[PDB]
């Protein structure tokens, strides 16, 4: 007894539209399931019991369709405070499997990032390590690429990124990539560069500095 | 009315043991069922364990068995999950929820399942103590400058005790101030950097001091960010 | 009432059925008619009417309809795809739900294959989900096949018990059977009238008779074969039929 569900994950649309999420179920037909929404930074919330028939409180823009092995959540008339995940739980056995989630994102005009590279502070080079930060400010398409280059060598496996939640004012993203080196290895090269690729850029932007040049 | 409270989680080394607490309120506790569900941070939900109305019907999951156990107090409307033989991998946030629709479990089908009034997390690292945070100022530079604005910030790195905060000018600047999600290194310690943009005419002109506060420890340091020498 | 997994089956037969007392009783929360709209029931005749009875949850009344799916319509009670009768349902929270839970109303939740329409299955064999044989004992992938609604009076609507009756009119190939009721008016004697006496359609003046009809006859005829007397049902008293006045 092992079952699993699927989902067309990570969709995006605009205000006042219709979305669809299809949880196809595994073998061993079942009988209705559920639909949860999860605003991040909080606890989940029930929206529709098996098949359909929502609960109370819900603003009634939601609908299911349960017919055996393939269920479709369908929301009509999008609203600007209804962007969250959406995980569906299937029951009727020992292990209550789940879905995968469905991240939601609004629609904004292509905005290119402001890019900025920061060399390591003199205090940190005393400690014996060098963080090289590169910032990408405001930007719709989050599918941005950050390529570090050290003396024109593409650097793989010594960086970390994180990205902010879509901004409630201008619906943009911001991204910070940190390159971490030892003081010793830092002092072995000259040009540190950060090359950003993005849909709002016709060709990639590189911000760079030269270690040891005021 | 119907609401749940949870406590008992924190930071512990692997191999150890810990029990949790899932209390109830409002409804009659000894008639419903109680579930256990988790999610590793940044992943999906996962059902962990369940028990009937104190009728000893566990039906555990894969791997979980032999490491977890369920204990509810019908007399005191509380429920405990005790786990042993940790893996340094089951660090997550955890939720308990009520059911009234299972089959070999609770008598009679009543209401909807999974009404989800819980919270509560648990860290399983090796940091143990609260590795203080090391701060550097990331100066505004022409490589960050573009036209009318330029960005400057503060890099606060190498700390274990997850909740840490950095403000700008004691909470003054709310424009352009954006703290990025902390990153967890291979060393086991967190790190983050918070940056704010400000008109390029105002590189050094006004005050831009990041106020770093570490609440599990008692670290409070103000660092000024100025253009590069 | 009767469980949902062993519904009852009453075979209403030759009678005078008045579906109006049903249709207008306003006590029914659901009265759907499929083969035939409701108001024309008291004007038709069939061979047999069957009435099935059971008790389900509140939000399971939408699976009692032709062409549905779900734990009830799959394997508890299946309606054929060309149904003819009507489905009636009303809430019964105060009768069937009792504090502490009424665990006497069960339903089947596992079966090998969906039911044929109007098929019934009261067996109680241990279900076998997985491939491992069960040998009549419970365990993983060996489940008892019956569950029980635990009804309780403080349940939100849609979890309170509803009682359901499914009337199914069938027409085999007999000579006749039960049907709607008849309505007779007053007896206006002494006026050229347009009359119908249980089939006899005619026109004329009706008058008290003095002929002695046998103990089984109905009306009277005359040489050259024209109806000239009838017998009234409501009273059973000879009456003559005189043509109108023409000239
Ligand atoms: C209530 C009613 O109809 N009563 C009548 C009665 O007056 C009449 O004498 C009898 C003749 O058989 O039929 C009956
Ligand atoms: C018909 O019913 C009336 C009462 O309404 C009764 O007086 C009469 O005797 C009945 N006649 C027959 C033939 O049943």
Author numbering:
A (entry chain K): 1 to 214
B (entry chain H): 1 to 229
C (entry chain A): 347 to 593
Paste lines from the article.
RBD, which directly binds to ACE2 receptor, is a major target for development of the therapeutic nAbs against COVID-19. The prefusion structure of S protein exhibits more dynamic conformational changes in S1 region, especially in RBD, which has two distinctive conformations, “up” and “down”.10,11 Only the “up” conformation of RBD can bind to the ACE2 receptor. To further explore the interactions between nAbs and S proteins, we solved cryo-electron microscopy (cryo-EM) structures of the S protein in complex with ten nAbs, in full-length IgG-form or in both IgG-form and Fab-form. Bivalent binding was revealed for the full-length form nAbs, which showed that the full-length form exhibits different binding mode and induces more RBDs to the “up” conformation than the Fab-form that is monovalent.
The structures are labeled according to the number of RBD bound with nAb as mono (1 RBD), double (2 RBDs) or triple (3 RBDs) binding, respectively. The results showed that after 120 min incubation, some nAbs such as P2B-1A10, P5A-1B8, P5A-2G9 and P5A-1B6, induced about 80% shedding of S1 subunit of the S protein. The first group, including P2B-1A10, P5A-3A1, P5A-1B8, P5A-2G9, P5A-1B6, P2B-1A1 and P5A-2G7, has the largest overlap between the epitope and the ACE2-binding site on the RBD. Their epitope residues are distributed across the receptor binding motif (RBM), mainly in the cradle region. Among the 17 RBD residues involved in ACE2 binding, more than half (8 to 15) were recognized by the antibodies in group 1.
